RNA sequence: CUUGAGUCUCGUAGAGGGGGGUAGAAUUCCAGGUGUAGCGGUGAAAUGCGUAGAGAUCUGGAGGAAUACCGGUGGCGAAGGCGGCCCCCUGGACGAAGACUGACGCUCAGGUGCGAAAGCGUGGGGAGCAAACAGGAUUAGAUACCCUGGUAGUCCACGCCGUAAACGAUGUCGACUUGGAGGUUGUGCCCUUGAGGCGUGGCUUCCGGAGCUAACGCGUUAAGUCGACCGCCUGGGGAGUAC
C-alpha cells in the first residue's frame, strides 16, 4: 500500500486513500489470521462452514422472499 | 509409459496381423516390456509406492492373461512364455 | 466475462507481461477469478505464468520489496 | 394435428426475443402500473415511468403498442425487461443512420460538460459526451443562450460504452474494459449510468462497457447511515455518478453520488 | 547537531503499545517516543489517544533537526495507526508518502498456539 | 527430441560478452543434431526486483529442439558460470517459432 | 458372437508419486551503524529483556522450516494423503473416433502390500513452534486454563511401529426407477453474426419427488427396486480386559 501525496492534495483525503488501499490489500486481516496457529482441520472446518452459511443465505432466504411478510 | 514406436514394434512381432494389437499374446508382451522398463525405475526409486501400485496391477493383469491363454490353448501359451522368458 | 475464451488462446505466456499486469494487484497480488471473471482453467495457468514471471524478475513478488 | 406443430413454428417465425416487435397491447392501466401482452407467457408489470414523455404525464391509453425486451424469463412469476430499453435500440438506429450520409441531423442542446463533454439530449433521453464534441471549434456554448437549439454533430462515440458526444452549433460545418481503463479515470470524470440492483449496502450503477460501480451507502445523499438506498434514488435509472477511484486490478471502480 | 529537511517516521503499531521513531532518509534514527513512555500503562497505552500523544512527543523531540518533509511507514496492527499519522500531521510536517510496512510472511514460520480463553 | 524454452540472464557488466556465450551455447546444441528454432537477444532490462544487489540485467530467450543430455550440460554450464545470474530451462510441447510479444 | 472385460491411435486436465535443483517473504541469531529509556506481556499483573545501550531503526551475513496472493462445498489419489516455480523418472483417469481380442469377468476366508499423527532405532539437522520442565500470575488450592522462558519432537536419510471420530460413523461389482439448480473437465454440430445456441460423455455440491426409514433423514453419487461375493452384530457392565 505505497502511496504518494499528490500536489495540492489535502492530508485527510490522503489518509482516506491510504486506508482504502490498506482495506483492499487485506493487510490487517492477513495479520489477524497469522497471529497464532490454526490447525489444518480447523481451517478446513471454517472454510466449509462459511461456504455452507453462504449457500443457505443465497437459496433459503430467496425461497422465503417469494412469500410476502404481511 | 511405453513409447509409441516401441508399442508398434512389439505389436508387429507378436501380433499375427500387425494391425490386431488386441491379441492376448501381444497384450502379455506389452505388459512384460513395461514391467521390464519399470524395474530400473523402481530399483532407483524404492519409496515410489504409488507408481509401484500400477506396476503391480499390470503384473496381475498379465498374470490373468496368461491363465486365460493356458486354459484356451496350451501350446500358444508355451511359445509365449519361451519368447518372453516367463518362468510361469 | 473471461478474456481468454474470447481471444481463444491455447496457453498464457509469462513473457507477455502487460497482459499479466492486468491481473496482478497494485501490491503485486494475483487477482481472484471472482473479480476478473476469468475461467477456472484459464485462471490456473495465468497464476502459473505470473509466478514464472516473478521468478524471472519480470513481475515483482510484492510492491514493498527491493 | 401438425396444424399445431406448424403453428408453433409459425408463431416462432412471428416473434423474436428482444424488444423489437411492437406487439404488447396495453390491456390495463392503473397508477402506478401499466400492463401489456406481447404473446408471452404472462403479462408485464410495467412501471408508469417507462411511459411518460418528457414532461411527466402519460401518453398511451388502452390498445396501444410498444415492444418491451426479453432473454430473461420468470423470476418467480411474470414476464419482461422494460420497453424503454427498446427505445434505446431506436435511438441507436437513428445514430447509426448518420453513417449512411455521414450526418445525423436532430436537435442537440448541450449546456455543460458533465465529464469534460457537454451533455446532449435527444427527445426523451439525455446522453453524456466527451469534451470536444459539444463544439466544432473552441466556440464554447457557455456564452450561447442557455440550453440553446442547434443539432447534434457527432464528434466522438465509444462504440461499446454508450458515451456519445455531439456538436451543437455551426450549421455550416460539415479483457476489454480492463487493459486501458484510464479514460474515465483521472480523479473526477462524471458519468451517466443506469443503476441495476441495490444490495442494501449499495446501488450498483454500472454502464460503461462491462464494468461494475458501487456508490455503496456512505455518499448517495448528505445523510450517512439512516439512508437505505432503495428509498433515496431509484431502481433502474440513469444518474449523476462519477468514478472517484479505480482499481484496474481488483476491478472495483468505487463511484460516488454525493457530488 | 546537523539539521535535516526530509526524513522518515516509522510507526510500530502493536496491540499493546505504539512506538514512533523519526529517522533520516538513510536509516539513522533521530528521535523516538512511545505510548508507554508518554505515561500510558496497560489499558491506557493500547489506545489511539496514547499513540497520538506519543507521536506528538516524538515530533517535539526532533524539533532541533528542523525536519519539514516526512514520509511515514506504518507497521503492525494497532490503534495508533491512523491516529498517530494524524497527530504527526497536526505537529506540522509535510507528509509526503504514507506506506504500509507490515511484515507479511508468504507462509514461513509457524505462529504460536491459539489462546484458550 | 524435446522442445525446450530457455531464458537466461546475464550480468549487465558482461553485456558485451553476451554474443559469444550465445554462440557457444548454439554450437553445443548443433553438436547433438539439435535444432534451434528461435533466438531473441532481449538486451539490457530493468529488473522488477534487484537480484544479487543489481537492478538491471541482460535477458536472452532461446528455443531448442535438443536431447536432454545437452540440456543438462547447458544447465551445469549456467550454474557454474558466474556471468549468468539466473536461467530458466522450461519444457514446451511444440517448436514455437513465432517470436515473443514484446520483441513485437 | 460382441454388449461385459481388456489392448492399440490422438488428445485433455490435474497439490497423483519418487529424485534433483532453485525463488521470494517473514521469523531467529551474529557483526556493525543511528539512538535513548524503556520494551514486553495481560482482564489486570508479574516473572523476563533493558543505560554492560534493549526495544525502535538501517546495512551486511548465517541457517532452518514453510510456501501468502492464485485458492474455489476447485483438482488429483485405493485409502492414508497431496499445494511456491523448474527439470528428470513415473502411475492412474477421462474424452474422440475407429481397429483388435473374444467372457479373458465380479467377489475374496487365509495370504501379500500401502497405511495420518504420535512413538521407537541409528546417523544428520535444529530457524519457528512446543509435550516434559522452570519461573510469574490466577485461585481456597491451580501439579491447569493466561504470561515469560523452554528440552524431546516437529525437519532429512534408512529401518520399525500398523493404530485414529483411518467418517459418508454408509463394504465391493453390476442393472433399473420422476426432477431442478450449479461447479469442473472433455467433446460433436451451429451464421462462435458475441461473452453465446443445441446436444453428448466423465467427476462433483446442494435441493427435492416416488419409494424407503424408529424418526432424523436418504433420495439416479439411495439409506429406493434387485442380483453376486465378502466382512460384521445378538442386552448393559465386567471388557476389547485377563490367560
Beta-strand runs (E) in D108-229: 117-121, 126-129, 154-157, 164-166, 193-194
Using CB atoms, pick whichever of F49, F57, F101 lies closest to residue C66.
Answer: F49
What are the Cα distances from residue D93, in Å, to D84, D100, D215? 14, 11, 32
CA-based nearest residue to E85, from E47, E64, E56: E56
Instruction: Report the neighbours of B using a cutoff of 3 or more CB pairs below 8 angstroms.
Output: none
Using CB atoms, pick whichever of E95, E111, E115 lies closest to residue A5.
Answer: E95
What are the Cα distances from residue E53, in Å, to E6, E75, E96? 22, 18, 21
CA-based nearest residue to D127, from D97, D98, D101, D157: D157
* Distance between C63 CA and the closest CA of chain A, angstroms: 7
Say how far apart CA F44 and CA F13 lie, in whole Å. 10
CA angle D62, D64, D67 (to 5 degrees): 130
Residue F19 lies in a domain: yes
Task: Answer whether C63 sits within 8 Å of A1, measured CB to CB.
Answer: yes
**Residue among A3, A17, A25, A30 with most chain C CBs within 10 A, to mutate:** A25
| A56 nearest nucleotide via C1' and CA | G206
Cell numbers 420468470 correspond to what residue? D74
Residue A26, all three cell numbers: 487485506
Nucleic strand G within 7 A of Cβ C22: no
Task: Answer whether C59 sits within 8 Å of F48, measured CB to CB.
Answer: yes
Report which secondary-structure segment, H or E, holds E24: strand E18-24
Provide the 10 A C-beta neighbour count for residue D57. Answer: 8
Report which secondary-structure segment, H or E, holds A3: strand A3-4
For C64, name the nearest residue in chain E, comparing CA atoms only. E101
Say how far apart CA D59 and CA D80 lie, in whole Å. 21
DSSP 3-state of A30: helix
* Cβ of residue A60 closer than 8 Å to a chain E Cβ: no
Is the CB of residue D168 less than 8 Å from the CB of residue D150? yes
Q: How many domains does chain E have?
A: 1
Nucleic strand G within 7 A of Cβ C52: yes
Residue F29 lies in a domain: yes
**Who contacts D40 (Cβ-Cβ below 8 Å, separation ≥6)?**
D24, D70, D79, D80
| A51 nearest nucleotide via C1' and CA | G73
Please return the burial class of F66, using the count of CB atoms within 10 Å of its CB with bins 0-12, 13-18 and 19+.
Answer: buried
At E8, give phi and psi (nearest 5°): -115, 155
Residue F99 lies in a domain: no
How is residue D119 annotated by DSSP? E
Residue A67, all three cell numbers: 412469500
Say how far apart CA D37 and CA D68 lie, in whole Å. 10
**Who contacts E44 (Cβ-Cβ below 8 Å, separation ≥6)?**
E50
* Cβ of residue E1 closer than 8 Å to a chain A Cβ: no
Q: In 3-state terms, chain E is what percent helix, strand and coil (to 5)? A: 25, 30, 45
* Cβ of residue C62 closer than 8 Å to a chain D Cβ: no
Residue F6 lies in a domain: yes
CA-based nearest residue to E77, from D67, D259, A32: A32
Say how far apart CA E17 and CA E54 lie, in whole Å. 10
Say how far apart CA A25 and CA D250 lie, in whole Å. 10
Provide the 10 A C-beta neighbour count for residue D179. Answer: 13
Residue F102 lies in a domain: no
Q: How many residues comprise chain F?
A: 104
| C47 nearest nucleotide via C1' and CA | G70
Question: Can the peptide bond before residue D32 be classed as cis, meaning omega within 30 degrees of 0?
Answer: yes
Please return the burial class of C61, using the count of CB atoms within 10 Å of its CB with bins 0-12, 13-18 and 19+.
Answer: middle
What are the Cα distances from residue B57, in Å, to B50, B51, D98? 11, 10, 73
Task: Answer whether A2 sits within 8 Å of C64, measured CB to CB.
Answer: yes
Q: A66 to chain D: which residues are within 8 Å by CB?
A: 76
Say how far apart CA D181 and CA F36 lie, in whole Å. 40
Experimental approach taken: cryo-EM
* Distance between A2 CA and the closest CA of chain D, angstroms: 15
CA angle D139, D142, D144 (to 5 degrees): 75
CA-based nearest residue to D27, from D3, D6, D45: D45
Side-by-side strand order, sheet with D46-47 = D28-30, D33-35, D46-47
Is the CB of residue F65 less than 8 Å from the CB of residue F42? no
For A16, name the nearest residue in chain E, comparing CA atoms only. E82
Say how far apart CA E117 and CA D15 lie, in whole Å. 68
Residue A30, all three cell numbers: 492477513
Give the domain range for residue F73.
1-92
Q: How many domains does chain C have?
A: 1
Say how far apart CA C64 and CA C26 lie, in whole Å. 10
Which chain A residues in 4-63 sit with Cβ < 7 A of strand G?
30, 37, 47-48, 50-52, 55, 59
Buried-state track D224-235, b at ≥16 Cβ within 10 A, e below 16: eeebebeeebee
Give the domain range for residue E81.
2-117
| B53 nearest nucleotide via C1' and CA | G91
* Cβ of residue C48 closer than 8 Å to a chain F Cβ: no
Is the CB of residue F35 less than 8 Å from the CB of residue F66? yes
Is the CB of residue F65 less than 8 Å from the CB of residue F35? yes
Residue D24, all three cell numbers: 404488447
Residue A29 lies in a domain: yes
Say how far apart CA C63 and CA D138 lie, in whole Å. 44
- Alpha helix locations (H) across chain D? 2-13, 84-101, 229-232
Strand G bases with any atom < 7 A from protein Cβ: 6-10, 12-19, 21-27, 33-45, 55-60, 64-74, 77-80, 84-92, 99-105, 114-115, 127-130, 145-147, 158-159, 183-186, 194-196, 205-206
Residue A69 lies in a domain: no
* Distance between F27 CA and the closest CA of chain C, angstroms: 25
| C34 nearest nucleotide via C1' and CA | G72
Give the domain range for residue C55.
1-65
Q: How far is the CA of E52 from the C1' of G215 (A)?
A: 63
Is the CB of residue E107 less than 8 Å from the CB of residue A32? no
Say how far apart CA E116 and CA B75 lie, in whole Å. 76
Q: How many domains does chain A have?
A: 1
* Distance between E43 CA and the closest CA of chain C, angstroms: 33
Say how far apart CA F98 and CA F78 lie, in whole Å. 26
At D256, give phi and psi (nearest 5°): -145, 165
Residue B46, all three cell numbers: 524404492
CA-based nearest residue to C35, from C46, B5, F52, E23: C46
**Who contacts C57 (Cβ-Cβ below 8 Å, separation ≥6)?**
F9, F47, F48, F49, F51, F57, F86
Task: Answer whether A37 sits within 8 Å of E89, measured CB to CB.
Answer: no
Q: A23 to chain D: which residues are within 8 Å by CB?
A: none
DSSP 3-state of D126: strand
Strands E29-34 and D238-239: unpaired
Provide the 10 A C-beta neighbour count for residue C43. Answer: 20
Is the CB of residue D166 less than 8 Å from the CB of residue D130? no
How is residue C30 annotated by DSSP? B
Residue E31, all three cell numbers: 528521535
Give the domain range for residue A50.
1-56
Q: CA F77 from chain center: how many Å?
A: 12
Is the CB of residue F65 less than 8 Å from the CB of residue F32? no
According to DSSP, the residues that pair with E8 across neighbouring strands are E23, E71
Helix pair angle (F68-80, F18-31), 10° resolution = 150
Is the CB of residue D67 less than 8 Å from the CB of residue D19? yes
How is residue E46 annotated by DSSP? G
Is the CB of residue D242 less than 8 Å from the CB of residue D256? yes
Cell numbers 497464476 correspond to what residue? C47
Residue D152, all three cell numbers: 447534434
**Who contacts D69 (Cβ-Cβ below 8 Å, separation ≥6)?**
D18, D19, D80, D81, D82, D83, D85, D86
Is the CB of residue D134 less than 8 Å from the CB of residue D101? no
**Who contacts D169 (Cβ-Cβ below 8 Å, separation ≥6)?**
D135, D136, D139, D141, D144, D150
* Distance between C9 CA and the closest CA of chain F, angstroms: 13
DSSP 3-state of B68: helix
Say how far apart CA D233 and CA D236 lie, in whole Å. 10
Say how far apart CA D157 and CA D179 lie, in whole Å. 19
DSSP 3-state of D112: coil
Q: C61 to chain E: which residues are within 8 Å by CB?
A: 106
Strands D28-30 and A3-4: unpaired
For D176, name the nearest residue in chain C, comparing CA atoms only. C3
Instruction: Report the neighbours of C using a cutoff of 3 or more CB pairs below 8 angstroms.
Output: A, D, E, F
* Distance between A69 CA and the closest CA of chain C, angstroms: 33
Q: How many residues comprise chain E?
A: 117
Provide the 10 A C-beta neighbour count for residue C57. Answer: 21
At E100, give phi and psi (nearest 5°): -100, 130
Instruction: Report the neighbours of E using a cutoff of 3 or more CB pairs below 8 angstroms.
Output: A, C
Provide the 10 A C-beta neighbour count for residue B88. Answer: 6
Nucleic strand G within 7 A of Cβ C32: yes
Say how far apart CA E69 and CA E83 lie, in whole Å. 19
CA-based nearest residue to A11, from D60, C47, E90, D152: E90
Residue E14, all three cell numbers: 502493536
Give the domain range for residue B59.
1-88
Report which secondary-structure segment, H or E, holds E43: none
Q: How many domains does chain B have?
A: 1
CA-based nearest residue to E31, from E10, E52, E17, E14: E10
DSSP 3-state of A38: coil
Instruction: Report the neighbours of A using a cutoff of 3 or more CB pairs below 8 angstroms.
Output: C, D, E
Q: How would you write chain B as a 3-class SS string?
A: CCCHHHHHHHHHHHCCCCCCCCCHHHHHHHHHHHHHHHHHHHHHCCCCHHHHHHHHHHHHHHHHHHHHHHHHCHHHHHHHHHHHCCCC
- State the DSSP string of F41-89: EEEEEEEEEEETTEEEEEEEEEEEEE-HHHHHHHHHHHHH-SSEEEEEE
Q: How far is the CA of A31 from the C1' of G153 (A)?
A: 28
CA-based nearest residue to C21, from C60, C66, C64, C65: C60
Amino acid at each position: 500500500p505505497v502511496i504518494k501525496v499528490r500536489e495540492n492534495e489535502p492530508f485527510d483525503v490522503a489518509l482516506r486513500r491510504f486506508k482504502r488501499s490498506c482495506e483492499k490489500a487485506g493487510v490487517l486481516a492477513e495479520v489477524r489470521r497469522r497471529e497464532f496457529y490454526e490447525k489444518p482441520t480447523t481451517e478446513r472446518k471454517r472454510a466449509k462452514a462459511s461456504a455452507v452459511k453462504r449457500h443457505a443465505k443465497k437459496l433459503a432466504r430467496e425461497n422465503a422472499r417469494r412469500t410476502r411478510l404481511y | 509409459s511405453l513409447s509409441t514406436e516401441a508399442t508398434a514394434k512389439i505389436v508387429s512381432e507378436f501380433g499375427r496381423d500387425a494391425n490386431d494389437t488386441g491379441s492376448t499374446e501381444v497384450q502379455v508382451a506389452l505388459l512384460t516390456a513395461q514391467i521390464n522398463h519399470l524395474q530400473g525405475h523402481f530399483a532407483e526409486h524404492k519409496k515410489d509406492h504409488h507408481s509401484r501400485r500400477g506396476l503391480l496391477r499390470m503384473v496381475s493383469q498379465r498374470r490373468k492373461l496368461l491363465d486365460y491363454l493356458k486354459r484356451k490353448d496350451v501350446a500358444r501359451y508355451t511359445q509365449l512364455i519361451e519368447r518372453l522368458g516367463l518362468r510361469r | 466475462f473471461c478474456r481468454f475464451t474470447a481471444e481463444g488462446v491455447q496457453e498464457i505466456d509469462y513473457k507477455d507481461i502487460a497482459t499479466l499486469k492486468n491481473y496482478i494487484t497494485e501490491s503485486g497480488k494475483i487477482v481472484p477469478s471472482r473479480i476478473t471473471g476469468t475461467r477456472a482453467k484459464y485462471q490456473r495457468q495465468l497464476a502459473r505464468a505470473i509466478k514464472r514471471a516473478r521468478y524471472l524478475s519480470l513481475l515483482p513478488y510484492t510492491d514493498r520489496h527491493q | 394435428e401438425s396444424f399445431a406443430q406448424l403453428f408453433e413454428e409459425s408463431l416462432k417465425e412471428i416473434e423474436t426475443r428482444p424488444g423489437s416487435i411492437v406487439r404488447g397491447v396495453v390491456v390495463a392501466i392503473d397508477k402506478d402500473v401499466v400492463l401489456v401482452d406481447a404473446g408471452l407467457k404472462s403479462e408485464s408489470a410495467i412501471p408508469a415511468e417507462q411511459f411518460k414523455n418528457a414532461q411527466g404525464e402519460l401518453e398511451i391509453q388502452v390498445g396501444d403498442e410498444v415492444d418491451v425486451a426479453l432473454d430473461a424469463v420468470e423470476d418467480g412469476f411474470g414476464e419482461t425487461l422494460l420497453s424503454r430499453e427498446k427505445a434505446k435500440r431506436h435511438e441507436a438506429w437513428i445514430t447509426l443512420e448518420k453513417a449512411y450520409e455521414d450526418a445525423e441531423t436532430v436537435t442537440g442542446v448541450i449546456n455543460g460538460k458533465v465529464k469534460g463533454g457537454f451533455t446532449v439530449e435527444l427527445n426523451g433521453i439525455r446522453a453524456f459526451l466527451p469534451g470536444s464534441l459539444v463544439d466544432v471549434r473552441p466556440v464554447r456554448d457557455t456564452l450561447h443562450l442557455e440550453g440553446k437549439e442547434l443539432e447534434f454533430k457527432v464528434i466522438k462515440l465509444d462504440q461499446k460504452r454508450n458515451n456519445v458526444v455531439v456538436s451543437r452549433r455551426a450549421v455550416i460545418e460539415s479483457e476489454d474494459p480492463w487493459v486501458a481503463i484510464a479514460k474515465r479515470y483521472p480523479e473526477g470524470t462524471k458519468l451517466t449510468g443506469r443503476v441495476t440492483n441495490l444490495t442494501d449496502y449499495g446501488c450498483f450503477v454500472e454502464i460503461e462497457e462491462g464494468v461494475e460501480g458501487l456508490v455503496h451507502v456512505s455518499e448517495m445523499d448528505w445523510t450517512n447511515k439512516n439512508i437505505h438506498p432503495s428509498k433515496v434514488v431509484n431502481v433502474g435509472d440513469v444518474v449523476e455518478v462519477m468514478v472517484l477511484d479505480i482499481d484496474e486490478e481488483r476491478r472495483r471502480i468505487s463511484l460516488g453520488l454525493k457530488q | 547537531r546537523k539539521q535535516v529537511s526530509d526524513g522518515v517516521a516509522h510507526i510500530h503499531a502493536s496491540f499493546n503499545n505504539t512506538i514512533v521513531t523519526i529517522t533520516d532518509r538513510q536509516g539513522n534514527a533521530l528521535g523516538w517516543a512511545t505510548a508507554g513512555g508518554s505515561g500510558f500503562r496497560g489499558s491506557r497505552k493500547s489506545t489511539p489517544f496514547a499513540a497520538q500523544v506519543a507521536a506528538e512527543r516524538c515530533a517535539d523531540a526532533v524539533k532541533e533537526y528542523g525536519i519539514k518533509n516526512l514520509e511515514v511507514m506504518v507497521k503492525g496492527p494497532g490503534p495508533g495507526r491512523e491516529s498517530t499519522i494524524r497527530a504527526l500531521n497536526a505537529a506540522g510536517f509535510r507528509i509526503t508518502n504514507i506506506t504500509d510496512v507490515t511484515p507479511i510472511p508468504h507462509n514461513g514460520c509457524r505462529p504460536p498456539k491459539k489462546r484458550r480463553v | 527430441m524435446r522442445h525446450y524454452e530457455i531464458v537466461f540472464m546475464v550480468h549487465p557488466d558482461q553485456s558485451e560478452q553476451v554474443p559469444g556465450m550465445i554462440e557457444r551455447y548454439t554450437a553445443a546444441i548443433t553438436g547433438a543434431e539439435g535444432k534451434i528454432h528461435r533466438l531473441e537477444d532481449w538486451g539490457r532490462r530493468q529488473l522488477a526486483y534487484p537480484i544479487n544487489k543489481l537492478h538491471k540485467a541482460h535477458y536472452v530467450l532461446m528455443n531448442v529442439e535438443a536431447p536432454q543430455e545437452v540440456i543438462d550440460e547447458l544447465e551445469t554450464t549456467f550454474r557454474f558460470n558466474d556471468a549468468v545470474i539466473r536461467s530458466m530451462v522450461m519444457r514446451t510441447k511444440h517448436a514455437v517459432t513465432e517470436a515473443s510479444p514484446m520483441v513485437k
